């Protein structure tokens, strides 16, 4: 069973809407030192922007929109890895639903990179994800 | 001489965001967190051999995102 589980949450939209996706995490109150991830969404939806703040960790997220990549370090003022703030977005994504999107369910999630680091030595947690359904009607 | 491995602050044989974490920690609490002599050499990746600062940690983050290249091995 995964050490930490991301909840992309579920959303409803109509064609033409922007959806704000708040990605939550449950680490079972374990601390996390850093994340380095990539995102995707089912076509024809697009991720238009990755927010540069992580509310769960009160830190700046570095992004590369060309690969939908994002990373950060999550340490307190003495360098200790942080427990994520319960209920707070770890990442926020802004998703565009084009005007001509057919009715359907379109998933947002990770795209083959989802690193969650434990410490300072390369050790990582195992990771799972759930939800991320954007139901367009 | 032993060839350096630019980016590999923690000397685990790969460059990834844990290297940025170690850099930050060594400045936040030097009593608790240190780099080895090799790690410190490895960690200075930008700034023209100015020493290790937060900009080195950020450069490793950029590298993990595909935005920059690490400096030459010596
Ligand atoms: Ca390393
Ligand atoms: Ca430097």
Author numbering:
A (entry chain A): 5 to 141
B (entry chain B): 23 to 96
Task: Reproduce, without paraphrasing, sentences from the article in which this PDB structure was first reported.
Cellulosome assembly involves the binding of enzyme-borne dockerins (Doc) to repeated cohesin (Coh) modules located in a non-catalytic scaffoldin. R. flavefaciens Docs have been organized into six groups based on primary structure homology. This classification was recently found to be functionally relevant, with the binding of group 1 Docs to the Cohs of scaffoldins ScaA and ScaB providing the major mechanism for cellulosome assembly in R. flavefaciens. The data revealed that group 1 Docs display a conserved mechanism of Coh recognition involving a single-binding mode.
The RfCohScaB3-Doc1a structure includes a single copy of the heterodimer in the asymmetric unit, as well as 323 water molecules, with RfDoc1a coordinating two calcium ions. The structure of RfCohScaB3, whether unbound or in complex with RfDoc1a, was essentially identical (rmsd ~0.37 Å). Thus, RfDoc1a establishes an extra hydrogen bond between Tyr-55 Oη (Phe-55 in RfDoc1b) and Oδ2 of RfCohScaB3 Glu-84. The data revealed that alanine substitutions of RfDoc1a residues Ile-39 and Val-43 resulted in ~100-fold reduction in affinity of the Doc for the RfCohScaB3. Complete abolition of Coh recognition resulted from the substitution of these two non-polar residues simultaneously. Overall the data suggest that the residues that mostly influence RfCohScaB3-Doc1a interaction are Ile-39 and Val-43 at helix-1 of RfDoc1a and Ala-38 and Leu-79 located at the flat surface of RfCohScaB3 8-3-6-5 β-sheet. Inspection of the RfCohScaB3-Doc1a structure revealed that the symmetry-related residues to Ile-39 and Val-43 (amino acids that occupy the equivalent position to Ile-39 and Val-43 when the Doc has been rotated 180°) are, respectively, Val-76 and Gln-80. While the side chain of Val-76 and Ile-39 are compatible, the bulky polar side chain of Gln-80 would be incompatible with the hydrophobic pocket in the cognate Coh that interacts with Val-43.
